[model samples]
Target chain A: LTEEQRMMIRELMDAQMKTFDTTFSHFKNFRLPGVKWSQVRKDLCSLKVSLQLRGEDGSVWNYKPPADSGGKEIFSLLPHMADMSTYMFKGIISFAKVISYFRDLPIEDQISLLKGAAFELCQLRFNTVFNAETGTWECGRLSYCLEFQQLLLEPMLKFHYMLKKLQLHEEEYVLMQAISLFSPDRPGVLQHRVVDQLQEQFAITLKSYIECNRPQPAHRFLFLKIMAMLTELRSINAQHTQRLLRIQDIHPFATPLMQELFGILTERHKILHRLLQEGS
Target chain B: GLTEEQRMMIRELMDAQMKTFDTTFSHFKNFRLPGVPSREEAAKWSQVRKDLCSLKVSLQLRGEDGSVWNYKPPADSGGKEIFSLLPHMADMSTYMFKGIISFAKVISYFRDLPIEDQISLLKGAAFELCQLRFNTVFNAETGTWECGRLSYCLEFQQLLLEPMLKFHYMLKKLQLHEEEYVLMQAISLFSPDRPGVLQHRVVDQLQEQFAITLKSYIECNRPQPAHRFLFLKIMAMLTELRSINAQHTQRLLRIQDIHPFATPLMQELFGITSSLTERHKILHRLLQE
Candidate 1:
């Protein structure tokens, strides 16, 4: 959390975001002679393609969840949104899987990264929808009732408002998610240095993106805000895990993909426990 | 005429056939085809079913942040609707692959056939087998056949739709048991007559065992006098399936002059080039996996 350390991490995140598919793999579409692109490298191109296709808010930034946009009931949205969201969740994990698939990281580290970051990544990525003025969270043109979800929704709102206040750029958002995803601190992440190195590279990429992209005066402190936001995300993630458990009492996670990511049967409980006790 | 031993053999064939059907569409939701003139089904699917099958289907590209592009089409293209056969065909390839792979899990006599023979039978039959699966969920009242998130009918689908609907209801009317539908899929998959099939009697004999099992299934479980026609009707359904099969291949193949192939798998299935070996390798690998 030193000033320079924070500055570098954010720069790394943004740098990688803009250049990941563009500069990294020039439309030199075909592989060059004697040049090697490992399956790991191939995974990134696939990752980027899947990310673009994962359906972001189209140009105008309106809410259109995949299920028909006909329903106004939070109840109805709950059933379909959980199902709908998991499909896009693939890109998030696909990214993790690609990163984890790197032979250097221990299999335990890979699993931990996926297990640890997804809940946080889920909300952050599922995030792009918070509006401070409207006091609403837009998820696919759907709204929520928020009743009985306080421990969860309350924490999410705090971060979402702050995040909205920060006016985070979309590129910064993915980097922040990547930063969280590459975390070495999660339980059983044995390959700490390698994971930490990966996270720092992304963090510095984020910092560079902010400096270059955010010429506005308000963005002067944006990197720290992003750094702070990542901290808040873990806390937010814990509540998210807790609340998903509550949500399950009503709707069991729609698929095993939903189960592992939101379902607390594995890495979630232990990590959420550590997250709570320290942050508690 | 048929001994107890023969009856048990058919039962084993029935057992093997039914094994794969339940799990194949694990990600499936109510398939929604398209609309031309089904008065009832058009209104039924007017709204996406709130149930995720629309209602929840596992195969849909939707997921977290998937909302980015999960969209409605822009103002009309020249077609009747905004749909394109390209992406739909891509998804259809997936369903087609899944159907083939699920069946590739195997049946006893069928397993002994040359891998090439196995490949030929499935390649010819995948379309009809999926049509049969699609038929199971066809809302006759709605006149719709839901694919993944979208419903499926045809233009080309329309030309196919008439017979598709006719055969669709023909099967639906029988109040088929689950085993019957699968045995039907099994029977469809073992076509001795499919082009490129190598051992004719062996393949033909396999189909007979299946057909016999299906007949016995109807006879014992659905013994109503009307059921007397079940065996004959199914045989006719297979005939109709054969008709749809060629119609789909011919109809689909003709579209290539209009546009290049949509996917490698589809290309392999419909094209005449030497990717035949590559196609077999792909399906054989799929079967092995």
Candidate 2:
């Protein structure tokens, strides 16, 4: 509530914002280049060859790629697609260094908060992928090379469809990321008030920023609308976390960091579900 | 036939659970009216509600359909006789108790649990379950709740209203059915890993049964693809509920001392049980003295 605390939150956000900009800038080419499309096709086909080779070697490679076909050929590159999944999180995790207060958090608290909020932040960061006008997630560069429809397939397309309805501003996206990082909802947090206060500070800062910047009367309700998206974001992240677990169940080859992140989130989710059974 | 018997069992257990919970905490809900208060007192209560409203604290109501009611004091005591905030408190308590009882009914074996376990589960799960009821009770298609009996006002607490409506919309998009809804209630209720359970494995086994039953039931009824995915999606809803509950609990605790009439049971129901336990410990020390 004090100026000092407000300054701290602002500074923390400023630092994280810089890191967010730098890290995700690399994804400027999330799509494979057209020059290499032929090469990529050859590599994807080669992956089929490697799968059989590994089978002969008797190595337990879990993801058996679908049959290589004309258009649906990328289904064989499931591992690469799965690896692409980690890029979103890798950029999110890099924010830990930017926000000094996050470093001050206990290791367990850090992991729990990160686990719970990672995909939410990713959704906020990947807002450009959603095209409200077209009602599609066909904006990012990857659209040209990768059929997002094929990559995400079932549940995720639904998530993207829901995301399209929410028209978000750049400022709102940044503020939402800050709010997600300071989540008070992570189970077993050490000091709830500190997290709550930090989150409130971001809330106040965002409100003030909106009030000053957007003079239009209609924009006043924008803050409330943006805040409501956080709930949707949480629900989406839960689905994403569960999806990761399901993938790992089928192919036990998640990167250690991915394993750690989903592990904490799913565990926290379970504990919260069981909270009702706890005695005072 | 089993479904018919299960429905009957749910009905019977719900009534008994409501009765038991009502008797146990009904005293706290009954606030003695102060008759007619001074003009100053009326203004004070009204202003307090306004202040909290402006501060974005959540003000919830209980009835057939949920709506946030603004406190409007009698403009000089000539209109409606000015008195207590007890009516609002009573309404909220009823809503809370009704939610807990419904959740207990869903668990089905709740009454068989020891009294301590019952309290523990109620303490842990009340807010999250209430969030679920808040969505379920609302008739989303009509933009009304309690089957179009109630609607929200512009002055309604946006803090609660915004998220509540969004969640309802999300549920609609998921196209949830009656069977899935029933199974979700059971899945949420049979959580066994709470801190002080004497028979956690038994509770876990019961949970597994509901899970297996729901899986089989979905396979029988729908027989579509991705049934497991649908089940996971429902679990994700509970995750969202937990996040919402955390916010509710945090704000309630912050305003705990301000709302003197907020009873111990109300605190317990809202996940503020640790504070209540500390108070009890202090009382025990005082009694020893």
Candidate 3:
């Protein structure tokens, strides 16, 4: 690699380290903070619960499956998870490495870049907490439940496990998120030329870092492996919304900010449908 | 008789609408270049676009506005073959790509506008105008649409189909002529308020002329007390058209859980391919100095 390319990777890694380490130090050390069994896992936990109910009086409760036969439990983006996602959402935008390039984009492309990538970035970042051996996402102080959200969960489990196995140095993880954030093909992005060039430079930086630091992929294979992970994240994020739609239909829950980030399309459909019925 | 100015406007619109189609067909007949014409090809496209817009008149919508009419295929065609709407919808995808090209062909003023704005206008207007044009071929007796050689049950489009079928019935009841269908499609194209239209004032003005042309034509031709409400009735279809298109865009992403789009047309309008790292090949070329 050229000395100039090496310098670019070196500089990118230094900035990425600050962005992730400063904002997400908690993700780095699961042992230091509240590490008890905060939420139930599928096989290794208590809640023998099955059905969850919401009533008209603003109360909600749950029930166990009949006869101790562990069934799929309900799925919700716990309020804490929503808030975590929302925080990371801002974290991706506010970083100098990201925001400098992001601000250069047309206003329409900026919004397009963020909306298209928000969930996918959340997947890459949150995977930091995923513990491969135990199949648990040790999310700081709390645990993410894994009974249902089967459509999203089952697909998520494969990639999360793979990411954990890669044991990506913090630098790799950060660069991967930046790459995902600048994806040029996401819906509604108009300035593909400009964004593609932005993404290309960062992508080359990532490849150069792997070449300089790790160097031996057994082949040029490691870069390919890292990129394939982003592809899988696409499938993961695709099913992400499909489950949210199902959750909305079946005992739905909502928060103002969570809905604001992800609810525009389905919400628009809801408004239009309501009007169609009112006239009907 | 209509007032002198209104009558002159009516004759001008109908005549220009005819001339626009004649040349519109000539320009994009081959469409040999790459989709949406690359930024490098800007100079050639600039001239074509200006020429596209230059032959405009006092009233008629450009030939591009009648893109839906262009899509309905020739009378040499009631679509002899029927492709069921399940499994592969590639035929319709091809049909949609061509219709969109026709819509993009004549936007002379858009030469100076951002490429993104042209996409938004083209994408938003395509489905609605396609519905208007498709209405002409509706076999109400058999409940089918004979588009080109392909027939559709339209079952997958049930939600969108309902409004289209209803409006088509009403349009048929009023006995709309070819000139009205052409004008209606023109109005649908110049819409100012679709999600990302820039230069909307120009769009709205162009749209207003089409509407005025339609209203005058209706008043001059359908001179009966009951038929006097025809313009209001025709305009009301625009409301339904917009509603149907919203649902169409909604259903597109809905089916992605199950996937045009290799061209700039694909990337710009629909964002077709979902894979992350497969960079568009032209994207590589467009970057090369």
Candidate 4:
């Protein structure tokens, strides 16, 4: 890791420990009038209780063993963010269901029913961000997905810190805890607008590969293939649209941004399908 | 005619009824309504049992002799002793009257119980419940009763005299043995109302037998956690009393509130009566006045 990265990790870990200490203290002496410093000290001691540092092979990390609090094992410097990996896979399943629902609707009904979506697209005017500093899919690569996850993890960490400070009741604590466990590895990977990037890259690559690899065919046959590509493009468009809808509802104040994203996705979807026709 | 459970039911009912008897009568010992005397007077009368028994015999014989009955009812005659306590006669009406009728029904049921079953059940229950012993004063001091007063005199009647009366009445109805016949004759004299007979006729015969039976059963039964049983008995008594007293208090308080048409004097009388009776023994003894 770079020196900057190592320093950031240390700062993040310190903040996380403080947050965990305060959260545990808040619950332990909730009956008391105000939070007590002594309770926070006791909670810090308890958090280090009985922790065992395990490596990737499920053995103690002997190579880079964690610091010992007395004889007690300390697991790591982080609040176990890797524990959140399962939630990302869960997000894929949610996206798959959204695609299934969109496919079941008739094409005409789909347009008429998505009036709010159409209006939302009109409002956003399709603003897009291009980052040449980062590598992404020239034709269907995973780099964009990786960058997106990093963006997601940052606020997620901030959100976790905020929730801990709020000291929600036991039930709310459990729900937020469940959410923290839901997604991992890819924070913004399953996000619909990014999925549009994948589909756009896939369409561009498929059209070019078809023209370069295959012999000349009838215009009718080529037109049919292009129409089929357009159909695939529409499904991808629908998937991205559903994701934008999801991101809108997951947290408050995300709808305006999502509307803007839908505008970009609809344009990307149109441009790619037009490229498929030109290839034909 | 009656089942074992039926008999137990009657016994519990009799015990429950007899609880009221003990409470009201023992209360009268100190309470001394307009005419009744105090506990000291009752104890003195308890001393002169033989003389009173002799007098009772003559009174009984006078009617047998076909003379006009000139004396007031023994219960109504308030002669400065328990013999004359108003509450004692109230016991006859409230408990003894109903208790005797219950006794008769219980006896008939026993008689009808095929002879072996009759003997078996009585022997079983008598064996089970005939004798129960405890330091009555100990229970009182423990605050075992929520009312926080230990009532030695009242408990003696409710636990000892009442159970013996019911048990003896059962035995007599059975006509089991000549010894049993003598036991019943011995038991009658120790009846709690007959404080007059305790010294001469009752103490020598029944009271000792009753005390021995209770002490023996408690010792032989070896009930696990006997202290808990002691606590349960006191709680059971208090719970029963508290419920009944609550209902009574509700009714009296209603009358005292000077309801639309209640007499002013009656309301005043109820006000005093309710307050006076609301107190348990410790509460009364602790009073400043």
Which candidate leads in TM-score? 1
**Candidate 1 docking band:** incorrect
Q: Which candidate, 1 or 2, would have the higher DockQ against the true structure?
A: 1
TM-score of candidate 1 against the unseen true structure: 0.43
Model 2's DockQ score = 0.00
How much lDDT does candidate 3 score?
A: 0.53
Note the Cα lDDT for every prediction shown. 0.57, 0.52, 0.53, 0.28
Q: How do these models rank on lDDT, best leading?
A: 1, 3, 2, 4
Model 3's number of clashes is 0
User: For residues A1-280, what per-residue lDDT tens digits would candidate 3 score against the true structure?
Assistant: 7886666556556655555543243432111100011122332233222222222222222222223223222232233344556566655544532445665666566666666777887777678876655545554334443433443345666677677777778777877877887899988788888888878987887787787788555545777899998988887677677655455444345444446546533243342223222310
lDDT of 2 by residue, B1-289 (tens): 2476445544554454444333223233443322217887666555544433422211222322221222222222231222234344435554555546544744447767665555555555665655555455555555544412222222233543555456666766667665656555555666786545567877788777667666655666664785657766677776676566566556555445345445555644554444333534422232222
Interface RMSD of each: 11.6, 32.2, 28.4, 50.5
Residue A261's lDDT in candidate 2: 61
* Better TM-score candidate (1, 3): 1
RMSD of 2: 30.3
Clashes of 4: 8
* Least accurate 10 contiguous residues by lDDT in model 2 chain A: A49-58
**lDDT per residue as tens, model 2, A76-115:** 3454444555676766766654576766666566666777
Winner by lDDT between candidate 4 and candidate 3 = 3
Could you tell me the lDDT of residue B22 within candidate 2? 30
